[PDB]
Design a binder for this molecule. Sequence first.
Ligand SMILES: [Zn+2]
Ligand SMILES: [Zn+2]
Ligand SMILES: [Zn+2]
Ligand SMILES: [Zn+2]
Lengths: 243, 50, 48, 49, 67, 400, 101, 33, 39, 45, 335
Amino acid sequence: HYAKIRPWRTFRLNECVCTPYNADFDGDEMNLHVPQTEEARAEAINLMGVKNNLLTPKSGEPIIAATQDFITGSYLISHKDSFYDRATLTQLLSMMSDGIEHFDIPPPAIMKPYYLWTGKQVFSLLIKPNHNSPVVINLDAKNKVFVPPKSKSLPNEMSQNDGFVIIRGSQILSGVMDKSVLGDGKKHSVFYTILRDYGPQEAANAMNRMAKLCARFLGNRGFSIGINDVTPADDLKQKKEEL
Amino acid sequence: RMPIMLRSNKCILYDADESKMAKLNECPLDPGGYFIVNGTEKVILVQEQL
Amino acid sequence: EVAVPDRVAKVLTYPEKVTRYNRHKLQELIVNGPNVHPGANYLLKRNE
Amino acid sequence: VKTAETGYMSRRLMKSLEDLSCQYDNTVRTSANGIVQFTYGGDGLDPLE
Amino acid sequence: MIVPVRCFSCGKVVGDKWESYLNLLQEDELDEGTALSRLGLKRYCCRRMILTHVDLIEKFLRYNPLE
Amino acid sequence: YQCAMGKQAIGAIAYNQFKRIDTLLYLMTYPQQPMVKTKTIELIDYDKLPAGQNATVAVMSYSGYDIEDALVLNKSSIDRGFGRCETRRKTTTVLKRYANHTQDIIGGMRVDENGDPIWQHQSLGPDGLGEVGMKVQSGQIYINKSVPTNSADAPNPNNVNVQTQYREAPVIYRGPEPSHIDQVMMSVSDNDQALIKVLLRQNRRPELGDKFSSRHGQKGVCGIIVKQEDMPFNDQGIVPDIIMNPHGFPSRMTVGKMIELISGKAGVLNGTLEYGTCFGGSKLEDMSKILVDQGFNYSGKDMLYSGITGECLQAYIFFGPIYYQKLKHMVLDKMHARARGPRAVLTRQPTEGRSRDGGLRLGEMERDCVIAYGASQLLLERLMISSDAFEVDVCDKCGL
Amino acid sequence: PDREKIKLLTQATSEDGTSASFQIVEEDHTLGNALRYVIMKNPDVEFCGYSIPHPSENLLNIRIQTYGETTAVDALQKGLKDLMDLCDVVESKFTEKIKSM
Amino acid sequence: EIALFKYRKARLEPGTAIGAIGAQSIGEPMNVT
Amino acid sequence: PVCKNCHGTEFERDLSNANNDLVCKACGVVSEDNPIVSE
Amino acid sequence: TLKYICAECSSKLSLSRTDAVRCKDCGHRILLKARTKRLVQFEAR
Amino acid sequence: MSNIVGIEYNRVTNTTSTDFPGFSKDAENEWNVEKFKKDFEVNISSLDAREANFDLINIDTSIANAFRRIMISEVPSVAAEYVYFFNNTSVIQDEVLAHRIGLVPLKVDPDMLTWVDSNLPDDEKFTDENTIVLSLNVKCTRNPDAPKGSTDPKELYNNAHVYARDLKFEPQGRQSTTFADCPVVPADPDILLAKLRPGQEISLKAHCILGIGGDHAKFSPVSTASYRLLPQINILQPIKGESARRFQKCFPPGVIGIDEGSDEAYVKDARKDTVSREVLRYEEFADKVKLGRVRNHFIFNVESAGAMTPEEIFFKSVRILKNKAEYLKNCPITQ
Ligand SMILES: [Zn+2]
Ligand SMILES: [Zn+2]
Ligand SMILES: [Zn+2]
Ligand SMILES: [Zn+2]
């Protein structure tokens, strides 16, 4: 790794890199080594850097992707009934960076009654933010659930839910982000495609741009769990008792 | 000299009433049952076998 | 980028040979001393 | 019962196979310069890439 | 030990109410619930400060080194 | 997972706990009895001297520093005294009587230039034993001690040359923080050979790294300490003490904490402590009836604003008091840093042990991980240069 | 005056002052979100957000980006002149009702 | 062009210790066992 | 005991950063590095 | 000065050095050092 | 639009601003001071000392949060910062007793002192007009009267409980004539501070200074300072007969009351409905009620710790938001 000197008393690291170490932050501890030549300082990066090891050499799948809270942050954005106006997109679009990247706003989806964007036009900007960035990808992937359509006439896109995901020219056209398209395991993820066609630098620039957003975003939206949404609805209690 | 465990009937803490035991600055809520051989305080554990 | 606390950052040193490219930095750093952060802990001359 | 024996198995397999590298004629072979196989697999291409 | 001079979560002071809440229990035997509502503790973040306060200062003092 | 950690949660010990001199005794400043009790804890009188205090948990995700069961507490609650522990540590010496009738002496405060104290003796007192009530720093002898130089010679039955034979061997306070001297006593053992037992004292505050729990078995490193104004607030102004993420309850399947929060909030509003026992306890349907009379939601799930942006939250937050006991294993005494230190004698390697000034073991499981990268120059550097270098001159023929 | 304050990032600005990105010390969300509301009521600005980079250090980055009419460095100097006039309505109206009571 | 670029890049480069990478991918966490 | 540059007779074992070196206060030249503890 | 005190007798003993380790007024053999008079400087947080 | 946050049984809706030009084609509600000055109104409810209750109308929820964060952090106050101990032989250890002194409120207001400058060496740092010094000396002894045993340890011992009123203000020079008409007192002078047994004394002095609230929560002037929004209940169909008393026990007891003429429910005194959403459970009021919460009617509620009136800090919060946005109208922009 590279370093950064911070004034507390513990080893901070990013969320996405905890998957190789399979760490869990529940009290465990890890040790660091600092080489002390000039030829082992250069060889630790170019052979053991974390840009060159987004892939595990067991199978070839990507191992450094969204951990178990970056998925469900970037799903409530891309939920089909999530609509933003201009002043809320702008605030949403300015947390994935720190006021450095130059965006240019695409024309909004809902247009006549009010001006509304969608939760995919704000997610197709963290891939290609403007014309000077060279990332343009194409990907067709099947989600984790994928309830099937009428199975002969309507194609894979026309599922009952959002289902099968379609991106053409770095714009999301359908589907959601539910760990089949961002996370680990599957070979056809988002972060695999930018890694494969544009070097690992453009992959890592688009991977921590999700983490700065999904940290800041859903702490101002809201998400909790409790008794009211684990208890049976009194029909699941009536039906289980005899079954 | 036999060592004797606390709250046994051979030691001075047997049936005290928070006034004798306050004089001896010992806790009322202490369980007892452990030797204080030369400093450290140790406890024989309940072994079992076949 | 791993983040490192500063109480361990001024124990773990790193040897750094003087050159004409980095000479004007390493004179400013040896005068900081080992109590403010960008300083040094030791020094070894070529004679010594 | 599994964790202490898996690292006993990832090391037994390690020591007998630790030195096999593709030479510049696309030929993976042992440290005493003797052929194990003429190409790594049927076509000699990186299993990760 | 002794009651904390301020509440942990909101910030208001509870140091002048520990002797009062007890004096509302020795004389005029009264419910624990209706005592510290009359006393002025409305929300449920101050009421835990006096419900659950174990008062170990009265038992530590009997071991004083001055006989 | 909780029985293995209930024996580690700091708290109170006994009533005589400021009288005893033990090796290492953790204390908490302001403990509180729990809200959801049990019949078991009143049959051993646990709540007569409890351990840990009940925070106001608002379980939700917040700022992304609570991902893998880490958790988020506020800076204003720590300054009011939420979880300020205290650590006491005995140390002792023995004044030994030798064969040639020579004792040990506690002379102290050697002087220089109109002033008695050196930097090392500002807290050593007049009589040699360090002064009760004032702090010590790194350095700063706090028990002075001198040991004779004829430690094993035969007794010469005369009186010729015995006036200056005491070489120094003091006791130095190490450690990375300044701690205070609580009480220092001197007495004699069973055989007449004097004892010294000074007991230090420091208290500290829970910065991040300090490991908290939940009494149901959910460990957590403190991840960030944000300010009060960035924390959310309900309609009344109640800022939560601690925020834990929602992403434990599906895998960990702890429905206790979801019930403990309901049986706890309803006890505060009613002024009575409630029982959670085994195979019984306070029911749920009779506990939402109290929770709807006072004005709140029937499932405890209140609504609250946000402190960054101002407007409401598009969901509802599960809000209430949960007993969070504080554990041991803090980071004030786990940070280690060895650059170039002591080396062992038979192997000339770094010394195993944090108290033996550390240096860590690059084993055989981690040696094979390096060669899989193909890296062949730091493998030579990490295993003879920074560890075990030595310059051997060997003959060429009959080479040894 | 002082110059460890509002400060234009030259690395992330356009060739003219249409798009500009600043870095303000010592000031958290209390200004950073108030200034966002009063700026976006300008009919000329298209993009004005902020971001705190890290909570260990203390500095805010405000972003401002408009159409071709006025420069962005002239947009926020109009913008935070207009929050100043926003408090004068609040302070005056509140103080004349206290005296009434 | 790109289907012959990725096949051309995917060939195994000389020097890769495919022994050591091999030994760590196999070892990891009527009837027959 | 005796330095090679100032020839002082007083040395100060510095344990402030867990190095435990041996060095004088006259010039600051370390007398022995990498201590060999009696295990 | 205000030298050594006793455990439960709580009598201030100024024992001459290298003479004895008991106290008067009582046979108890544990002597607590009493607190200094010197000012000590704390914070309030 | 229509600035009503929509309460329902699992969500709230349109909580954000939508008050800016470029939201619809007819780009209305641009900024205009005279269009703001007419609609902003203030309604002061029950006002006393140590509590305020007042409304702020037709301001967007961005700037109502700006006044909350400043009353907790930015408005300065006084509390202890250095405690100097003389002989303490109490069971309460020193820097715990020195910590409980720091959180005690004081009735002296700020603007009487200046900000301390810690760049100077530490003997003219505490000058004569940025620091007041207050101390206490108290000793517990035996009370020689004749009660019987086990009685109250308020008459076996004299002064065995120390209180906040024991902090005797010890005025230094140059301020014996300035703090003469208004001496300083702890704002709640009955705070229990320690406990003593005979033979145990406490003797110290504290140097309380001028501090900012967001640094440490000694310095915060408020008890707590937050707000609400105004709830709003709409009734679609007339609830009549037996159901309207069932509709009445699912609320706080003031908010809706029965029309005594014809048996029909209507809204009484509002602003008391805490949102218990109890009408959502019952699936017979699924259409009769559409309740909500209006987005421009902030029910403030500030409190004071005792230092100053509650209508002073809210004057002082809005006064220093302006200066916070005035200090960088007048400084250059470095490239
Ligand atoms: Zn409270
Ligand atoms: Zn030879
Ligand atoms: Zn020398
Ligand atoms: Zn005695």
